[PDB]
Write a protein that binds this DNA or RNA. Sequence first.
DNA 1: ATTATGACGCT
DNA 2: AGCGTCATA
Length: 430
Amino acid sequence: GPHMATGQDRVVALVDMDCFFVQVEQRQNPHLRNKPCAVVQYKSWKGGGIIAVSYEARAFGVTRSMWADDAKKLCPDLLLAQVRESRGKANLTKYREASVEVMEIMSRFAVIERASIDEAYVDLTSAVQERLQKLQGQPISADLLPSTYIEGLPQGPTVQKEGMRKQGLFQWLDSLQIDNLTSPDLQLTVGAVIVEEMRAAIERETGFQCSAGISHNKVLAKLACGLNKPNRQTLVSHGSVPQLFSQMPIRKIRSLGGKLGASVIEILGIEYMGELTQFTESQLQSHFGEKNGSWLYAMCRGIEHDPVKPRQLPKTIGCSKNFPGKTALATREQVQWWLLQLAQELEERLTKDRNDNDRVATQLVVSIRVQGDKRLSSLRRCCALTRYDAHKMSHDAFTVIKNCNTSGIQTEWSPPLTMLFLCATKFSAS
DNA sequence: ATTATGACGCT
DNA sequence: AGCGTCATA
Ligand SMILES: [Mn+2]
Ligand SMILES: [Mn+2]
């Protein structure tokens, strides 16, 4: 245990915007503020599909992946904002641009890894070292942590939520050894001070509220972020992990929400993350492979080494559209019209990207789905991307897929297409 | 008939 | 390269 690496070398934060597309719409339209509201795409089919939900609306049981007509049954006064439509399809440009606003603010504090349209990881290790020296070994005042929860506290020997939060924070700060500049708990605490500042800057400069997690790695930071949403941040210390994990369903951990997580549970006969500690690393590797087993063995002990990648920008720019049920594309001209629609939005986004970010895509991926099939994608073919023009891209896309047509006559398309996807990839500096 | 994305791992 | 998994609004 002298040599037992603690996995406490880094301070990592995860910042995630609260109900993000909803906040974007509420900033634009003040009538939606502090109301049960949701963001919907399309409208004809069952009122449209919900993709974001305000906390007021979640109180009524409204969720994402709910049809708006069904959501209105739970919440009759639900207000709805519609995703823009351009060239016959949902267009997410407003939310992508809002995301850039937030990411550029975070980048003033540290290197960030864009993890989704509305969240980024922050490696704060260096910022913390600097703030620690600025500090002088003064105590950290509760006043510097006005929206911070310390997971696991208060504990040991009032019934208000904010009262509980301060109780826990006071116990944490009372215990801290601010004397030691290499203390991991102290380092997390200064990390949280910086994230309060970052979150204040995001709200001041965009109007958007967010939550955050602070811990020693990405998985714990992501988990921490969720603990006290909305508009709060949570510090998960190395020490808080045994109790936290002792009743944490395995599926709650990032990457375990799917088939792998289900196989951990079934094969091992366990339910909670903490139960993993009873297996040897070799045992876990035998069941889940070398990489996953090593990852699980360390992760259940609160340790993970995945770095925060310095990447603020998406690696791919894609445009996709489903043609569900009876709207499936059964005609050549239909297929070519929609490929052009997709290609025109792609050209628009690619040109904007080239101007803002000094880079050019070099590969065009074309993906389709066929009726009665499978899975999200039936077939994925790549071809060169040499020019940002929609007509070339759409013609090229048709070329690589046109032989998928089992149809006897080339005017018809069989079996009908239920999805088209164009994705630009393999960016190079330009 | 959730839809529209976007990253990463496997072979 | 093409496929599959996991994730987010
Ligand atoms: Mn969010
Ligand atoms: Mn998110």
